[PDB]
């Protein structure tokens, strides 16, 4: 029964494949060479940076590092708004609330710690420490100021009610550690990439895997939603980035070159979605014309691998972080 | 051109920079270590003197040098994702049960996995072979044979009972062979034999850490 339906799903996706995206996109003017320079380099992290997230206001970002401190920067003036001491030096994720009131941190301690930035008494304090994951937290993302989603190395993703401190919903389909998570623009559904080389689409309310996508040889480190919300792009240690379409249920495109052996640490989409920006273990980030799968540029200013990559909500700038402990803003 | 409020923000940022620098200055003093043992290793009891589900941490001092030892408890067989974090540690402490021969091939495979990891390329390993008393009583009894599990022991030249010395040197030699096969010299394995209760294991950890630091310093100064 398992094999018969799996072959039926293969037939269903193969029946739809009348054309490639390369055929449809073929007669379009290319974006051309895109040149971006590090307009600002933000320094003050004394160890390797693992995660960053932009604020919705587009001026404020948060970063996480191994030295054990979470620092919030005013990007325009290169000024540190806050520096937050962390109980565990080992942190692999950070998030910034949409309202900007809170930030979240997760790590090998398996606990998601939420911080209240705006308080009377003028300090950053722990609003909540969320327990219930038996593995390290690889990714955390905020629905609201009350609700946060997390992905963990125990092969399960969860939705939390921060005020209650308990998991409202648990998502359990993966057979391996879940590395990344991306909320949709509408927020009603989200996707996760995992070490079983599959990406699953999760409906946040019911708690069920609507669709599962498999095209990668190796683990999927990074995942991002196309700005429309009907497609997403995954990054892997296969050294390939693949664009997946929710409605068609299949891979439209794959972004690879023979020179590129290194794994993709992070991915993000430009505001229009024409540009797919990916971060690699080769210490550089390559910018892909997402419609045509042509490399349009390279961002190389980092001594060590790029751990994180993010694109501004307004779309003005790209911020990258790396293990050289300097995170740079590109425009 | 900068408002009074923006000037005060700049002063705040500079004070934050000062405090971060002080914290990093504190951080450099400590030497950081990672403990790895599959099971039956007795890895928790290696350092007798001095003793949080996600990570277990212990602090021990010898000769006014502070050491941090990290064990990551809950994780499964594949450690490739969390091991990326521990690439700046001074040394890795790898604990193996030399007494058990069924475990030994799996321990050798795990040591190879630690040795050949991309992120752990520059990190030396301090290898403790454990429960030597258990091994000694087992070889003196002679009921079990390393020759059965390993063909090479059946014909091996010894370099304390002489059979015990032969068996222990063979057990060491396999691990040092996996270590030596690379031959780059950026990272080297320090093999030790440890009883179930030994007063000095922190001393051994400290002297291999001093050797590691000495070698990195010699490479840094361009001497060798």
């Amino acid at each position, epitope marked *: 029964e398992a094999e018969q339906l799996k072959n039926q799903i293969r037939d269903a996706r193969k029946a739809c494949a009348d054309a490639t995206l390369s055929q449809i996109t073929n007669n379009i003017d290319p974006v051309g060479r895109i040149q971006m320079r590090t307009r600002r380099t933000l320094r003050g992290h004394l160890a390797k940076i693992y995660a960053m997230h932009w604020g919705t206001d587009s*001026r*404020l970002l948060v970063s996480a590092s191994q030295d054990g401190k979470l620092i919030i920067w*005013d990007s325009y*003036t290169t*000024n540190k*708004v*806050h520096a937050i001491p962390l109980r565990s030096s080992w942190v692999m994720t950070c998030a910034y609330a949409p309202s*900007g009131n809170y930030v979240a941190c997760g790590g090998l301690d398996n606990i998601c710690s939420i911080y209240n930035l*705006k308080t*009377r*008494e*003028g*300090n950053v304090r722990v609003s909540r420490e969320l327990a219930g994951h038996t593995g390290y937290l690889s990714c955390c993302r905020f629905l609201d100021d009350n609700q946060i989603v997390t992905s963990s190395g125990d092969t399960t993703c969860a939705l939390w009610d921060i005020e209650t401190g308990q998991q409202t919903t648990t998502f359990t389909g993966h057979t391996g550690d879940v590395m990344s998570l991306s909320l949709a623009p509408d927020t009603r559904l989200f996707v996760s990439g995992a070490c079983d080389a599959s990406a699953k689409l999760w409906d946040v309310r019911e708690g069920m895997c609507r669709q599962t996508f498999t095209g990668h040889e190796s683990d999927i480190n990074a995942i991002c939603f196309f700005p429309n919300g009907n497609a997403f792009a995954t990054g892997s240690d296969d050294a390939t980035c693949r664009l997946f379409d929710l409605r068609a249920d299949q891979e439209l495109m794959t972004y690879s070159h023979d020179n590129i052996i290194c794994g993709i640490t992070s991915v993000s989409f430009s505001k229009s979605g024409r540009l797919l920006l990916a971060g690699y273990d080769d210490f550089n980030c390559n910018v892909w014309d997402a419609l045509k799968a042509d490399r349009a540029g390279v961002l190389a200013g980092h001594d060590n691998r790029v751990s994180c990559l993010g694109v501004t909500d307004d779309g003005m700038a790209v911020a990258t972080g790396s293990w050289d402990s300097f995170l740079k803003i590109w425009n | *051109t900068v*408002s*009074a*409020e*923006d*000037k*005060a*923000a700049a*002063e*705040r940022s500079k*004070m934050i920079d000062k405090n971060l620098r002080e914290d990093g200055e504190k951080a450099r003093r400590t030497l950081r270590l990672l403990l790895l043992g599959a099971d039956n290793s007795g890895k928790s009891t290696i350092v007798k003197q001095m003793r949080t589900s996600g990570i277990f941490e212990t602090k021990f001092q010898v000769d006014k040098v502070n050491f941090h030892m990290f064990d990551v408890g809950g994780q499964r067989d594949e450690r490739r994702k969390w091991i990326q974090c521990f690439n700046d540690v001074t040394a890795i402490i790898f604990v193996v049960d030399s007494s058990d021969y069924n475990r030994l091939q799996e321990a050798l495979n795990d040591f190879k996995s630690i040795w050949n990891n991309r992120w752990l390329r520059t990190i030396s390993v301090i290898l403790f072979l454990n429960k030597q008393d258990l091994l000694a009583e087992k070889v003196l009894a002679g009921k079990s044979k390393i020759e059965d599990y390993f063909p090479e022991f059946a014909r091996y030249t010894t370099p304390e009972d002489p059979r015990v010395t032969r068996a222990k040197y063979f057990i060491r030699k396999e691990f040092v062979d996996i270590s030596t096969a690379s031959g780059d010299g950026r990272h080297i394995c320090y093999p030790h034999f440890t009883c179930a209760v030994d007063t000095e294991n922190a001393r051994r950890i400290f002297n291999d850490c001093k050797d590691i630091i000495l070698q990195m310093n010699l490479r840094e100064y361009n001497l060798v």
Partner: single-chain antibody
Amino acid sequence: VQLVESGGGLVQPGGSRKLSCSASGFAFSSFGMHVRQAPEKGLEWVAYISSGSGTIYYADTVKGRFTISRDDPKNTLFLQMTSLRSEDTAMYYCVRSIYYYGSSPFDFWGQGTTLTVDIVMTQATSSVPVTPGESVSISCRSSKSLLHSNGNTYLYWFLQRPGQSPQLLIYRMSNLASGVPDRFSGSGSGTAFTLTISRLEAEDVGVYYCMQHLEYPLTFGAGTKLEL
């Protein structure tokens, strides 16, 4: 969060007195600290001490004659006054201010201690008649435009209810201080500003002061009373 001011009483002219305010319930080291009110006249800003004591400013009248200091471990701020003069008679307020992106300076004010011994901000109306439930608009003007190239316009509105210390309502001409109802709103162009109070109620009634934080010295208008 509390600031309690101590010291005061009669000083003969030419004498010296020390006033201290004690901080409880907030991270006193992080906050930059400052203001006096003459017995029936408007507010005037005396001195400022930054976080860590790095930066000090005084107004021209007090400078050379007043000294401000903070004891961060003890959580106390002092003002050392010498050669006191009949002008110095006033109620001295201890104010907390924290400066970062999105912060609200001047949010909390102490009760104050009695003592008995340049952008020009103008509030056109001394008093305004009000009906409860009736919208009221208060206006202020600056000599120099308070809009800065960063884009912030540094205008602050304060409320002093009868027998109470001033309370921040609006910071930077549009943002609303925490704990303030939505009825207050601030609309302003550069050099011409206003505060709009709609559906006025009891306890909205007091003297309203407009302050500029574009540059030191910090100047308050005389302000507009509201009367039932």
